[PDB]
Design a protein around this ligand. Structure first.
Ligand SMILES: CC(=O)N[C@@H]1[C@@H](O)[C@H](O)[C@@H](CO)O[C@H]1O
Ligand SMILES: CC(=O)N[C@@H]1[C@@H](O)[C@H](O)[C@@H](CO)O[C@H]1O
Lengths: 424, 426
């Protein structure tokens, strides 16, 4: 299992992409490596990368390479997210896709070519880099197609599947030959939102690894309590849930983002949330890695962020180590060698003829399946999660080593909140 | 006398060069504009780069604007800066803190007015010590964001729009007068042609130091009357003369801040004549502050989603060579560097409410009765000006403007006006 942090540049956040202070970035990545992390995740801005649909900015590509270079010289593997897209409640969409040029990145064919050219351009610029570990198509891109988005980019579930297949397929074989990974990222709506065009099986079958972003402001922390077994184990629950919709029985699961948000978790307890959540993740088999959010706190001078976003960094505004920064550093040591035994008792999830849930609000906070797992795990049963389709096929049940099943009737939860802050 | 300049579109990477300016090319760019006979340039920083967060202005972006002003001055050109873009050639550049999850109106959101206030002062503060910094415009055609046609409209009533203009202009207005610079604001022709538009005609002609007007004959004039009609060729002069009626100062200068020969309505073979005869029409109107053509350098062929006609608007080709219109504009600078315009004596009355605004704005719009009454008067060689009904009942203002003849016409709405450059935007 791997340990890393999502890199928020100190001093100027992602606005530093306009004019990177490379000596500060070098000091930033050196601090992350000093925690014991082995990798880092970085976020270029789509508006700077591709200011026109048919012109990618060479300076922005070169600046991404420099950060990849500096990350490696600190001893860190660097994972790059291509399309931002969305970052901490803000949207950075190039001018050729807004207002007079409004379009859907998921259905507009010429916009798919632009995303296609940018993905190849990012990989081509970094192909020679030894620390270039892999690509994610973009941070939580599905938020653009959800109905909660104030400028939704429309798309049905089939178009979303073709969207993933097009971009992932461009660089999938280069990634395999080169020894790198290609993956995609979605917020918890893919697991929790009924009617969502991103289906759970997309995250667990498309791409090389399943990415998961565990945030307990989604309803789990207010419904059950900031440090309930439901909340502290939410990251583990997302790990075990995602496996049910995967075809590969030992597919790695990467918790690509997880933090202790101040809006539901208190600062005095935030270190305990870090340690125990990682204890929960460390008990699940086949975890690719744990990437914390985030590296360095957002400067106090920047505005319109949700308040809790300013304290998410592992290093404070003056560069000193945070209380959670000591918890994440100590957790890296505690779990660098811990291996997780196979999980024997599975929770059955009733699913479509094609692998999709009947009622996703039952896997959502407050739902029966959600609570059945938390209750089973709380009692030390280390449960996994299976679908109804796999439950009637002894081959897959054998490959995964399940010997005990659990049927639970579906009751919808109502605690899920699709937005970080009430203002949205 | 009147000034001649060019709107500066950076060659090679358009306004995308702001991401990483090639200063040696920009230096060569401004050298070409000066060689035409131009005395000034209008430059356009991008709001998304200037102010990536509501409470943080990027020092690198401020310094890049300063370097461009410096290169313009070392080229011998006065530099006019537009603060808020905003809108440029059918594209919107709105920062992330004013979009989607942070959607807001730049005209009514108090914190967005403070942010625009900080950027306006920062731009002026950064450039105040520089000799070639000639003045500020609040932004290129900012009214298009509040128009009812806008797909992401930032709403505002006419009273709120007045407060927006009064807040930003008043910030640097007193500094501008002692420092010897001008402060102004810009609106597209919807302020003159669109009924119900929250930007009123008297805003453009009373607020700021000079009246700005952007003359584009794809607004319906070239399609209705013909690309090389007197309605089309005199549209810029008509926009000058129309704006004066709503001005309180009888000799306030009018700045045709942008004018081009758009290829979607004018044929390339005719664009040089359109340049010459339109500037001839402007040169005959009194108190023309200047004529600023659009634009300097054509957009490179590789850039996409522009309306096709935009690629050929530049005075210099993609390889730096001068276009036929570039030779027409250069020839016009020489032809009218010394020509002064006699007073215009015959005025057209604009029926107006009790508070200075037209009864029917669509009647001065293309296809309207006031519009054609002036075009017909100008076609007959009568050199007409434009007055309001209120000024017609005040012999002092008529005396101050030297008017001796009136021409009253009934209000008939036009139906030729087009609020968008391309059919794709309807
Ligand atoms: C507009 C908004 O609230 N966006 C947030 C996003 O920043 C966050 O990464 C995600 C985590 O689940 O939750 C979304 O609601
Ligand atoms: C959406 C659109 O076409 N907007 C154009 C704008 O780009 C142009 O600068 C202006 C000139 O008057 O005319 C508007 O209609």
């Amino acid at each position: 299992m791997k340990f890393g942090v999502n890199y928020t540049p100190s001093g100027e956040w992602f606005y530093t992409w306009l004019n990177p202070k490379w000596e500060v970035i070098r000091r930033d990545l050196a601090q992350i490596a000093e925690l014991g992390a082995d990798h880092v995740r970085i976020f270029p801005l789509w508006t700077l990368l591709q200011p026109n649909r048919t012109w990618i900015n060479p300076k922005a590509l070169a600046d991404v390479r420099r950060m990849v270079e500096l990350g490696g010289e600190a001893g860190l593997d660097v994972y790059v997210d291509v399309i931002q897209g969305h970052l901490s409640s803000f949207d950075f969409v190039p001018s050729w896709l807004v207002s007079w040029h409004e379009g859907s990145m998921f259905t507009d064919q010429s916009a798919i070519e632009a995303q296609s050219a940018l993905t190849e351009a990012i990989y081509g610029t970094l192909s020679d880099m030894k620390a270039f570990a892999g690509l994610t198509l973009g941070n939580e891109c599905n938020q653009f197609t959800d109905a909660t988005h104030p400028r939704r980019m429309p798309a049905n579930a089939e178009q979303i599947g073709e969207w993933l297949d097009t971009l992932i397929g461009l660089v999938a074989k280069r990634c395999r030959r080169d020894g790198r990974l290609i993956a995609h990222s979605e917020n918890d709506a893919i697991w929790y939102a009924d009617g969502h065009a991103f289906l759970p099986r997309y995250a667990s079958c498309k791409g090389d690894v399943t990415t998961v972003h565990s945030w307990v402001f989604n309803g789990t922390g207010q419904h059950y309590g900031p440090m309930s077994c439901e909340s502290l184990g939410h990251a583990a629950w997302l790990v075990e849930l995602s496996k049910a919709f995967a075809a590969d029985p030992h597919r790695p699961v990467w918790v690509q983002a997880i933090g202790a948000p101040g809006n539901v978790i208190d600062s005095a307890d935030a270190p305990e949330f870090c340690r125990r959540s990682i204890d929960a993740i460390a008990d699940c088999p086949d975890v690719f890695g744990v990437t914390w959010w985030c590296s360095h706190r957002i400067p106090s001078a920047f505005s319109d962020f949700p308040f809790f976003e300013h304290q998410l960094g592992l290093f404070d505004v003056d560069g000193t180590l945070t209380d959670v920064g000591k918890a994440f550093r100590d957790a890296i040591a505690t779990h660098r060698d811990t291996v997780a035994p196979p999980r024997t008792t599975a929770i059955v999830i009733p699913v479509d003829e094609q692998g999709d849930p009947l009622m996703r609000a039952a896997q959502a906070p407050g739902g029966s399946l959600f609570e059945a797992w938390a209750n089973l795990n709380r009692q030390g049963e280390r449960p996994c999660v299976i679908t109804s389709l796999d439950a009637g096929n002894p081959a897959k049940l054998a490959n995964r080593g399940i010997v005990r099943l659990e049927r639970v009737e579906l009751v919808a939860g109502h605690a899920y909140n699709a937005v970080s802050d009430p203002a949205f």
